[PDB]
Amino acid sequence: ETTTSLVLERSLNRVHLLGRVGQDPVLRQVEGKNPVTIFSLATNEMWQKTTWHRISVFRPGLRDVAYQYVKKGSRIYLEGKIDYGEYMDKNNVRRQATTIIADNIIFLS
Amino acid sequence: VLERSLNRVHLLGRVGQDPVLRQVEGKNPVTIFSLATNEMWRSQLGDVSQKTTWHRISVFRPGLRDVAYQYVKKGSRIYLEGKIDYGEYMDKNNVRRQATTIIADNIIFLS
Amino acid sequence: VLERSLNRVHLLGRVGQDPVLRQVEGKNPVTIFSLATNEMWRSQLGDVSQKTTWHRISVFRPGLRDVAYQYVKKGSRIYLEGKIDYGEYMDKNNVRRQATTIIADNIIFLS
Amino acid sequence: ETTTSLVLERSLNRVHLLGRVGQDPVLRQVEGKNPVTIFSLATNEMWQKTTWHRISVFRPGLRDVAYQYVKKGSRIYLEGKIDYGEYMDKNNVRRQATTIIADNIIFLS
Amino acid sequence: SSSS
Amino acid sequence: SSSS
Ligand SMILES: [Mg+2]
Ligand SMILES: [Mg+2]
Ligand SMILES: [Mg+2]
């Protein structure tokens, strides 16, 4: 690993979700500086199992549109990337707090 | 009859280590490996940031699981599609913790 | 045995007119409709450009074709997935011309 | 249709292709002002049929990387949007010149 | 405002 | 150059 470890070699980290919002969005600040809009999204598989996703909206403008227009029970299509949100809990345990960082949200209801 | 939803992930990246073929007695055999993707983004000289994201990949599908175990290698460049599953589980406490994996149902070898 | 390739389109838009159920004798029946998608992009007041793209959608799959004909309406908002096919054909001249369609294999009604 | 016909209502026009480049890329100018890199991409279906796509790269920087690194026989993954490129030919006939406008290209060979 |  |  160097400054020459540019890794211009490209990769792809893309998720598409279509589902229903679990609760009204909330607004948080991360570190001291980055406002974020957060809500939950439920998707289902035939197989049954409801999968509950944590959605984070960091993009300016999108995050405000999300906070004002996403509501519990909203039907949403969205796209973004997976971030696993690893961290250390109270007792040094490494946890995951997986979130989909949405860069595109389409409102269906 | 619940309406239609979608849970679809596309990754293209480099495998982090040789896959593990895992049979924890009870649940059926699963091929496990890690996939690295890089996110580059700008912030004298051109100041540019880079983050590596490490995905855990599970392959349950019977034919794909074996193809994955035998052909995925450390450094392998692959494209895959699947769904995200968070693997909720009760620990020693009365709540749940997550073990997120991407359940691959399609893999393309690019190397 | 040719290697793996991908030809995958995702659209989400509003249908432009009631679908046509087309049986040009010979080829099997096909549901045809148009889907509009909008692309907005910036360029006093905030100067912003907008372009509407009109996609021709064909549904050949036997069960989906009928669901499409009966339930797609003008103004319907839908999500669909398919592959692009350019529909090469010889005209009255000794070369080929194209009639591009998206062959839908999955449709989600959002309205 | 007005200035109030903002159509903030969002839509999605997204194509993903993985295939082989047919010939070396060429460089064109559209109208008088927009440099573009153009090449062909072949994809196949099991069913057989080879589908030949026209790829256009307008994004600055991406278009130069494409022109310098895409070669006949290159294996490429790419993403973009469909543009049908409608026009009038010599005899007033409305033709299609469908192209995939790539905004992301990943080099595989 | 601009519309193609 | 910055790497998280
Ligand atoms: Mg996509
Ligand atoms: Mg804001
Ligand atoms: Mg340039």
Author numbering:
A (entry chain B), D (entry chain B): 19 to 65, 80 to 141
B (entry chain A), C (entry chain A): 25 to 67, 74 to 141
E (entry chain C), F (entry chain C): 1 to 4
Show me the paper's own sentences about this structure.
However, these structures show different sequence assignments for the 15 amino acids at the C terminus. Arg38 is close to the surface that (in the homologues) binds the DNA. Importantly, the guanidinium nitrogens at the end of the Arg38 side chain interact with the side-chain Glu27 carboxylate group from molB. The mutated Arg38Gln shorter side chain is unable to reach this region.
SSBP1 encodes a mitochondrial ssDNA-binding protein and interacts with POLG and TWINKLE at the mitochondrial replication fork to stimulate the synthesis of mtDNA.
